[PDB]
Design a protein around this ligand. Structure first.
Ligand SMILES: CCOc1ccc(S(=O)(=O)Nc2cc(CC(=O)n3cccc3)c(NS(=O)(=O)c3ccc(OCC)cc3)c3ccccc23)cc1
Length: 285
């Protein structure tokens, strides 16, 4: 694609923002608000459309977890409701394989899901697939080699360094090598055939460390840390670089956006969001 979209988020309450960043010229676009505020949601893109999945409305009047799927068309600057999920999923992870959206884990009240469901845009229908081996909220999701990876999270009692791999053709999950660090609320993405896990919360502190998984060596290796510690950060890849957006550093809701260059193994700051926030959904189109 060519813009980095960021939807929703949290600062004092759940937010309705849809904004877009153009890395070519540094401009920020203010686009149509979400119809209902939400934080702890995920963003993805299928066929030029942006989707906002799951999350929760943390408001002064109450907190309501979201089963919603909403569809944003950049050509009309309009959000439309799509079919809701089987269950609300706050602190959800999502990935896309073959034009289908996978909604992974997340929470509904105190229920920590291990369930996974798959959306087909052509039918506007969700179906459950095989559940993960582990309940995971605050989970990161990456898609690599047409496999779906669920990384880290919190199972309701244990904060996780574990990760597992979903095989869509076989409809089954397998545990993979765990991370070096316990991480919930990390940003997880794929860049140049590796799975990156950036930031998160290890049970003691928000993290600035970043590690990556090589699927053939089956090993996780640390790379350069971020400039800021961040949990519930947004993450995406744009032109061979990772972008991380906002998150909570333990004290402030960050407006910082950093960019990771894999060739030089360096982070740098590229822009600031218009306001500090955490728990956003991010995608590129
Ligand atoms: C003063 C901070 O205020 C806020 C309010 C609201 C937010 S949010 O809108 O982004 N939603 C989220 C909250 C939490 C959890 C969280 O931080 N809070 C904060 C208030 C209530 C929950 C998560 N998981 S986590 O990062 O793994 C994590 C981090 C810290 C933890 O313990 C600290 C002792 C436990 C888990 C999340 C993971 C993914 C996506 C969203 C998350 C963020 C911060």
């Amino acid at each position: 694609g060519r813009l980095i979209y960021t939807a929703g988020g949290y600062f004092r309450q759940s937010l309705s923002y849809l904004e877009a960043y153009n890395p070519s010229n540094g401009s920020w676009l203010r686009l149509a608000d979400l119809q209902v505020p939400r934080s702890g949601l995920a963003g993805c893109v299928v066929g030029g459309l942006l989707y906002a999945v799951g999350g929760r409305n943390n408001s002064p009047d109450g907190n309501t977890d979201s089963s919603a799927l909403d569809c944003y068309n950049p050509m009309t600057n309009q959000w439309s409701p799509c079919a809701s999920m089987s269950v609300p999923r706050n602190r959800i992870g999502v990935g896309v394989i073959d034009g289908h959206i996978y909604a992974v884990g997340g929470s509904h009240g105190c229920i920590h899901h291990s369930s996974v469901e798959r959306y087909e845009p052509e039918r506007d229908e969700w179906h459950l697939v095989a559940p993960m081996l582990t309940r995971r909220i605050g989970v990161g999701v990456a898609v690599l080699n047409r496999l779906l990876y669920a990384v880290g999270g919190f199972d309701g009692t244990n904060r996780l360094n574990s990760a597992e791999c979903y095989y869509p053709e076989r409809n089954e999950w397998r545990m993979i090598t765990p991370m070096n660090t316990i991480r919930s609320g990390a940003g997880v993405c794929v860049l140049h055939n590796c799975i990156y896990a950036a930031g998160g919360y290890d049970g003691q502190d928000q993290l600035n460390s970043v590690e990556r998984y090589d699927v053939e060596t089956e090993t996780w290796t640390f790379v350069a840390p971020m400039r800021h510690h961040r949990s519930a950060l947004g993450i995406t890849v744009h032109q061979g670089k990772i972008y991380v957006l906002g998150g909570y550093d333990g004290h402030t809701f960050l407006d910082s956006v950093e960019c990771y260059d894999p060739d030089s193994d360096t982070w740098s700051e590229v822009t600031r969001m218009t306001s500090g926030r955490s728990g956003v959904g991010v995608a590129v189109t």
